[PDB]
Nucleic acid binder design. Structure first.
Ligand code: DCT
Ligand code: MG
Ligand code: NA
Length: 360
DNA sequence: AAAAA
DNA sequence: TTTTTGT
DNA sequence: AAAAAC
């Protein structure tokens, strides 16, 4: 009987999606607008898809869309077409578009984003084999790893694999920092069965500034000694307790982090042919100062749409500024502290949304 | 593309 | 109508 | 560099 909010942070979105026919089409249309750099149309299709994912029933008529926010005329035409014959002519045209197909294929490589994919398409490349064998192209260390471990990285990480990775991370971390708190974040924290990677947040209540800085180096050196580190990139912290973010679009937070590819031996997975006996897994580790742990956990849990709307709600409804490191109140002119995610939600005047309810 | 200012 | 859309 | 990694 209540009104569905336009904000994902005011909706409970579990993995039980009753509208996959509509949201799969809307996700394709959004992805195409992202590729065509049409940010506004992209966001409108992402918001429409997100709200339909929150519904406790499937849409079976146009009357069912009444009172649902983020569904304008364009989105309602797409829903009408899917109700008509079970297909989206708009999404079908995108799936057959050469630019869209090439972008999906090229960006599926680790180390290849929008700019490199667009460059290769405009050069006339259409297959990964023709890219890899070209004698004029030069590849980054990230792309070399992306091509070498391609098949493993494109097959998604399942729950037994994520759990096996969690054990490896926790065992390595507590060996060097016994009081450290390790939390698996991302999709797996939200209850997902699969993911493109396994993400972790690491924090320590008693570690020194040096101990905190050295942990990622100690843990990765230990794995390097065991020949388990297939790719490793450690980004030093640029965290400053009172500095403003400076960048209008900063994809990464300022905490110390590492982007890894780990060699996951089959014997460690408690879940068929064996093969090489191991699988390459994308793993991200984030180290944050103990007092920022709630902001970092909230930002790394996701989903991306839940994070966007949290920040949008904070700005437009509360005149607050939120990020992975802090929460600032522009009216009271004070930073708001939090020991848990619950305290962040309470500062924002939001009902607490459980991690498994953040799948917007 | 949709909603707010 | 013009502005905003996370970061 | 730009670009990529969330
Ligand atoms: N544009 C983005 C990308 C990521 N994140 C945050 C929320 C998720 C977290 C981890 O990023 P991903 O690994 O890409 O997210 P995911 O939710 O874990 O999905 P997947 O299960 O595919 O790894 O970082 C975000 O706020 N905004
Ligand atoms: Mg993830
Ligand atoms: Na990529």
């Amino acid at each position: 009987v209540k009104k569905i909010s336009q904000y994902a942070c005011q909706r409970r979105t579990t993995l039980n999606n009753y509208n996959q026919l509509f949201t799969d089409a809307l996700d394709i249309l959004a992805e195409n607008d992202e590729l065509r750099e049409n940010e506004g149309s992209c966001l409108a299709f992402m918001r429409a898809s997100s709200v339909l994912k929150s519904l406790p029933f499937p849409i079976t008529s146009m009357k069912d869309t009444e009172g649902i926010p983020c569904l304008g005329d364009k989105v309602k035409s797409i829903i009408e077409g899917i109700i008509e014959d079970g297909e989206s002519s708009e999404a079908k045209a995108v799936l057959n578009d050469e630019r869209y197909k090439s972008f999906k294929l090229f960006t599926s490589v680790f180390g290849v984003g929008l700019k490199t994919a667009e460059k290769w398409f405009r050069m006339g490349f259409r297959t990964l084999s023709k890219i890899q064998s070209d004698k004029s192209l030069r590849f980054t260390q990230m792309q070399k790893a992306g091509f070498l471990y391609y098949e493993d990285l494109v097959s998604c990480v399942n729950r037994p694999e994520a759990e096996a990775v969690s054990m490896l991370v926790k065992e390595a971390v507590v060996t060097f920092l016994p009081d450290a708190l390790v939390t698996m974040t991302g999709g797996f924290r939200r209850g997902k069965m699969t993911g493109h990677d396994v993400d972790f947040l690491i924090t320590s209540p008693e570690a020194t500034e040096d101990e905190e800085q050295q942990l990622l180096h100690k843990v990765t050196d230990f794995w390097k000694q065991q020949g388990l580190l297939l790719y490793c990139d450690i980004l030093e912290s640029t965290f400053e307790k009172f500095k403003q973010p400076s960048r209008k679009v900063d994809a990464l937070d300022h905490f110390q982090k590492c982007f890894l590819i780990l060699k996951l031996d089959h014997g460690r997975v408690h879940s068929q042919q064996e093969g090489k006996g191991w699988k390459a897994i994308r793993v991200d580790l984030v180290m944050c100062p103990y007092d920022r742990r709630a902001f970092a956990l909230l930002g790394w849990t996701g989903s991306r749409q839940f994070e966007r709307d949290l920040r949008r709600y904070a700005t437009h409804e509360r005149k607050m500024m939120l990020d992975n490191h802090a929460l600032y109140d522009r009216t009271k002119r004070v930073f708001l502290e939090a020991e848990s995610e619950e305290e962040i939600f309470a500062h924002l005047g939001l009902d607490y949304i459980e991690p498994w309810e953040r799948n917007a």
